[PDB]
C-alpha cells in the first residue's frame, strides 16, 4: 500500500486586491478627507524615501509614490 507521495506545495490564497491607496508622483503630498466617514481637514505629508509609502494619521487611506507602486513585487499588506 505504499504508494509514491505527490508533493503539492500549490497554496493560493488571495488576501484581497484592493487597498484605499493613492499613487503619487510627489514624495509631499496634501491629503484632505477619506473614505467612509472618515475626514479632515488639508494637510502636508510627506513619504518617507527609505519606506516608499506613508499611511494618514487621520485617515485609513495609504499614499504611495508611482516608483514603489509599479514594482512587480508582492506588496502584502491588505488587510491584518
Given at each position: 500500500?505504499?504508494?509514491?507521495?505527490?508533493?503539492?506545495?500549490?497554496?493560493?490564497?488571495m488576501?484581497?486586491?484592493?487597498?484605499?491607496?493613492?499613487?503619487?508622483?510627489?514624495?509631499k503630498?496634501?491629503?484632505?478627507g477619506?473614505?467612509?466617514?472618515?475626514?479632515?481637514?488639508?494637510?502636508?505629508?510627506?513619504?518617507?524615501?527609505?519606506?516608499?509609502?506613508?499611511?494618514c494619521?487621520?485617515?485609513?487611506?495609504?499614499?504611495?509614490?508611482?516608483?514603489?507602486?509599479?514594482?512587480?513585487?508582492?506588496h502584502?499588506?491588505?488587510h491584518?
Amino acid at each position: 500500500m505504499r504508494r509514491q507521495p505527490k508533493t503539492r506545495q500549490e497554496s493560493a490564497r488571495m488576501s484581497i486586491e484592493a487597498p484605499e491607496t493613492v499613487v503619487v508622483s510627489t514624495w509631499k503630498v496634501a491629503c484632505d478627507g477619506g473614505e467612509g466617514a472618515l475626514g479632515h481637514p488639508r494637510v502636508w505629508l510627506s513619504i518617507p524615501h527609505e519606506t516608499g509609502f506613508v499611511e494618514c494619521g487621520y485617515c485609513d487611506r495609504r499614499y504611495i509614490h508611482e516608483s514603489f507602486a509599479a514594482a512587480k513585487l508582492e506588496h502584502h499588506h491588505h488587510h491584518h
